Amino acid sequence: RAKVAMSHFEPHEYIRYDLLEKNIDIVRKRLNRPLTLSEKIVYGHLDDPANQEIERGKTYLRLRPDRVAMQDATAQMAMLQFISSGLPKVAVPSTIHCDHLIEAQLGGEKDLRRAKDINQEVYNFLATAGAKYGVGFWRPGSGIIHQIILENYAYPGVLLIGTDSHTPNGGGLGGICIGVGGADAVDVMAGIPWELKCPKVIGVKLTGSLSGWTSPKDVILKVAGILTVKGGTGAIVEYHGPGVDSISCTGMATICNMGAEIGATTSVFPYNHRMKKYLSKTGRADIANLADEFKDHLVPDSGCHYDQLIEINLSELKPHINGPFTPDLAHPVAEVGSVAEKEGWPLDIRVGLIGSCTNSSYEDMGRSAAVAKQALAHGLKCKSQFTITPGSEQIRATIERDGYAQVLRDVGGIVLANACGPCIGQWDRKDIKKGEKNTIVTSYNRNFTGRNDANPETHAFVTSPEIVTALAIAGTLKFNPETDFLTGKDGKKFKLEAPDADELPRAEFDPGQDTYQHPPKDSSGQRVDVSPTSQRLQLLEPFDKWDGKDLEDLQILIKVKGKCTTDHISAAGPWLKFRGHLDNISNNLLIGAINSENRKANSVRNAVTQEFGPVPDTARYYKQHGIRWVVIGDENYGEGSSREHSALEPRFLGGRAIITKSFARIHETNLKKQGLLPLTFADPADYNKIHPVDKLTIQGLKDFAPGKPLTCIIKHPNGTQETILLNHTFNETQIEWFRAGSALNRMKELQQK
Numbered sequence: 213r214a215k216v217a218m219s220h221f222e223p224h225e226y227i228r229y230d231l232l233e234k235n236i237d238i239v240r241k242r243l244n245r246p247l248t249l250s251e252k253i254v255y256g257h258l259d260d261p262a263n264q265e266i267e268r269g270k271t272y273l274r275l276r277p278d279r280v281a282m283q284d285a286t287a288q289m290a291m292l293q294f295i296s297s298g299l300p301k302v303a304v305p306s307t308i309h310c311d312h313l314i315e316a317q318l319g320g321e322k323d324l325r326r327a328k329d330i331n332q333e334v335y336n337f338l339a340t341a342g343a344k345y346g347v348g349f350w351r352p353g354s355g356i357i358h359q360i361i362l363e364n365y366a367y368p369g370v371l372l373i374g375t376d377s378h379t380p381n382g383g384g385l386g387g388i389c390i391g392v393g394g395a396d397a398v399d400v401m402a403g404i405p406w407e408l409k410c411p412k413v414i415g416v417k418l419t420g421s422l423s424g425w426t427s428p429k430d431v432i433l434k435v436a437g438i439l440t441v442k443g444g445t446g447a448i449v450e451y452h453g454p455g456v457d458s459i460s461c462t463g464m465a466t467i468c469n470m471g472a473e474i475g476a477t478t479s480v481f482p483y484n485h486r487m488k489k490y491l492s493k494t495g496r497a498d499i500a501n502l503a504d505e506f507k508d509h510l511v512p513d514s515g516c517h518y519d520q521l522i523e524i525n526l527s528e529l530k531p532h533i534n535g536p537f538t539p540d541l542a543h544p545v546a547e548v549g550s551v552a553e554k555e556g557w558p559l560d561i562r563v564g565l566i567g568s569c570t571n572s573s574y575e576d577m578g579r580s581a582a583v584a585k586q587a588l589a590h591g592l593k594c595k596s597q598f599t600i601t602p603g604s605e606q607i608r609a610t611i612e613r614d615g616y617a618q619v620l621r622d623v624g625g626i627v628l629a630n631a632c633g634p635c636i637g638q639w640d641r642k643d644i645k646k647g648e649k650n651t652i653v654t655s656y657n658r659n660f661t662g663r664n665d666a667n668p669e670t671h672a673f674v675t676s677p678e679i680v681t682a683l684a685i686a687g688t689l690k691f692n693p694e695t696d697f698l699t700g701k702d703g704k705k706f707k708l709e710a711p712d713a714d715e716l717p718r719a720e721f722d723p724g725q726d727t728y729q730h731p732p733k734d735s736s737g738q739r740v741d742v743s744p745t746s747q748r749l750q751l752l753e754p755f756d757k758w759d760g761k762d763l764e765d766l767q768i769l770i771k772v773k774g775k776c777t778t779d780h781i782s783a784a785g786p787w788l789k790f791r792g793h794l795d796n797i798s799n800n801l802l803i804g805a806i807n808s809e810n811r812k813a814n815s816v817r818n819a820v821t822q823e824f825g826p827v828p829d830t831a832r833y834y835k836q837h838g839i840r841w842v843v844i845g846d847e848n849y850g851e852g853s854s855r856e857h858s859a860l861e862p863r864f865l866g867g868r869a870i871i872t873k874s875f876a877r878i879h880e881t882n883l884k885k886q887g888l889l890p891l892t893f894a895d896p897a898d899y900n901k902i903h904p905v906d907k908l909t910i911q912g913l914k915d916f917a918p919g920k921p922l923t924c925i926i927k928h929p930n931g932t933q934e935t936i937l938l939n940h941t942f943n944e945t946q947i948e949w950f951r952a953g954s955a956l957n958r959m960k961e962l963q964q965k
């Protein structure tokens with residue numbers, strides 16, 4: 213066909229749209245109905261399109277992804293599992309991005325130099341394991357994983373998986389990009405089919421066009437408020453309608469990115485002329501030309517059916533700000549000042565932060581510079597502290613060149629390294645004491661308790677970068693950029709004009725400094741060294757195979773009340789230091805979850821000693837003494853980040869099952885991957901039948917089967933027993949992971965030994 217390479221770094225790996233077309237056509241001859249765009253790209257990547265059972269929301273699809281991307285906080289454990297497999301080389305194009313371990317403190321270059329010293333051992337391990345197994349390596353300072361992928365690797369029709377829940381960002385260039393845990397990434401790197409539950413499809417029809425202060429971020433802040441954090445579970449969100457051509461390619465990536473906060477499997481936009489333009493300005497005009505020849509397969513079929521349809525008229529959409537606490541608590545910027553006042557949320561903004569993968573594009577930086585230049589023209593600077601995170605080295609070099617970084621420094625901002633930084637709590641914040649109630653506004657995406665600075669009382673609101681800039685200049689939530697007046701230096705009241713700026717540089721992008729390291733795919737004689745006394749890296753010892761018996765008289769470690777995110781289960785911030793060391797990071801297990809017994813975090817009753825203490829310590833005591841335990845949770849358990857450490861840590865400390873009213877998708881898969889039993893109540897009111905003091909027996913593991921519930925006997929202390937039924941979503945592939953002790957153990961059994 214055409215021989216167009218997948219990227220500039222893999223000149224010999226060609227885009228297979230011929231394959232995509234062939235598979236789409238086998239499938240539509242079987243289904244005889246129009247296909248949505250996400251169905252075309254997902255079913256076009258089936259391992260066996262002729263025989264695959266296809267029912268939305270019901271069957272597990274066996275898929276062949278085109279490439280794997282990892283960032284350094286999840287790559288360590290994905291590579292330690294790949295090293296246990298014993299396999300010599302990765303089977304698909306794979307990259308590691310070093311963006312999560314650079315702490316914001318002094319700003320830019322200074323923080324990057326310090327991170328390279330402090331994290332030497334880890335950057336070393338990832339670069340060496342990358343060279344050995346054939347994984348491309350983007351060095352610290354290169355940029356945030358998703359901005360590097362949009363700029364270099366995402367293209368229309370790609371199926372990409374990434375070990376990060378904001379991998380959907382790549383949907384802004386028409387590809388299906390899905391967040392997974394490290395063991396799912398090991399499957400694909402090892403060459404075995406990846407399984408995904410066939411998604412439902414929510415269609416969002418965009419009408420009109422954005423104007424004034426409204427930006428792409430407002431579309432997904434509105435959709436999150438409508439669908440809520442659990443409304444997208446099990447579905448792909450597919451944006452369509454005439455309003456789509458009104459949004460820039462990076463704007464579309466912003467909207468797909470934050471679809472992770474409603475639990476969506478991913479989000480996607482159809483290939484159009486704004487994506488073409490972006491591909492050409494990022495050196496990929498040949499890929500835009502080939503996608504023009506396969507365009508019919510890169511847009512939805514006429515008359516395709518969405519399981520749910522939402523319509524948003526972009527011309528009536530006004531600026532939003534969401535939070536504090538949850539990303540679906542949506543408010544117009546015009547009313548947040550009065551709601552804050554009413555709810556007792558601090559009105560004064562201590563810090564304004566722009567960037568993160570969600571909003572760190574060239575257009576985002578130009579729109580923020582456009583607000584800031586107006587303030588400067590009246591002799592003002594930010595009243596709040598103000599930080600700017602460029603998404604990649606190319607964006608940092610280009611906004612530096614085109615003058616936007618200096619405008620942002622002149623209003624009082626500090627430019628941080630091209631890294632996650634304050635977005636996952638890698639921030640040496642000293643302006644508030646811990647426990648001090650305060651408000652920060654960001655252009656990020658999640659705003660869960662203690663995620664940016666480990667202070668539970670920080671009220672974090674997420675909005676667009678131009679509104680963070682306007683509010684940082686005013687210093688208060690009680691400021692609406694569209695209506696209100698600031699007073700300049702000269703005494704005159706003035707109003708901010710709505711920002712206007714170019715979507716892409718007129719000139720070319722300046723690539724900045726060299727940051728990619730290609731694998732020698734010749735030589736590869738690397739020894740990966742993991743010191744046996746390291747506190748940051750530790751090789752894995754395989755989990756135990758199932759004993760063949762039912763699980764009797766299980767102790768409840770904790771019955772959790774309410775929201776239980778993967779940041780509650782395995783916190784980030786300071787704990788990122790131990791992401792390659794399973795025993796050391798397991799000391800954060802469930803320390804943020806609220807115990808229903810006392811409503812406290814990290815205080816559970818030890819059943820033997822009858823002392824209340826830390827959850828990690830209590831789980832290790834039970835494991836030392838042979839007491840097998842269970843976690844009981846509420847709705848949407850495991851919401852958020854994809855970190856498989858939330859599943860590895862309960863397995864390591866002796867847990868056996870997690871029983872909840874419902875699971876977020878990625879965490880439920882990660883639990884199954886690690887040999888645990890994720891089970892849901894067949895009747896959710898049964899959550900109220902179980903008391904912290906009860907022992908539980910799970911029966912029927914011997915004839916464990918797809919679609920057959922398991923029986924749970926609740927043993928009450930007074931002698932009463934009650935039987936309830938528990939549902940599971942295991943298929944036979946997955947029951948094999950459980951019987952082997954983990955998916956990695958099963959894979960190693962298939963290697964004939």
Ligand SMILES: C[C@](O)(C(=O)O)[C@H](CC(=O)O)C(=O)O
Pocket residue numbers: 285286312375376377378636784852853854855
């Ligand atoms: C840090 C993270 O990027 C996050 O935003 O929560 C994570 C991955 C991780 O825990 O390392 C995510 O979204 O999956």
Ligand code: SF4
Pocket residue numbers: 356357358376378568569570631632633635636657
């Ligand atoms: S959401 Fe924040 S922490 Fe996750 S990749 Fe993006 S910038 Fe990094």
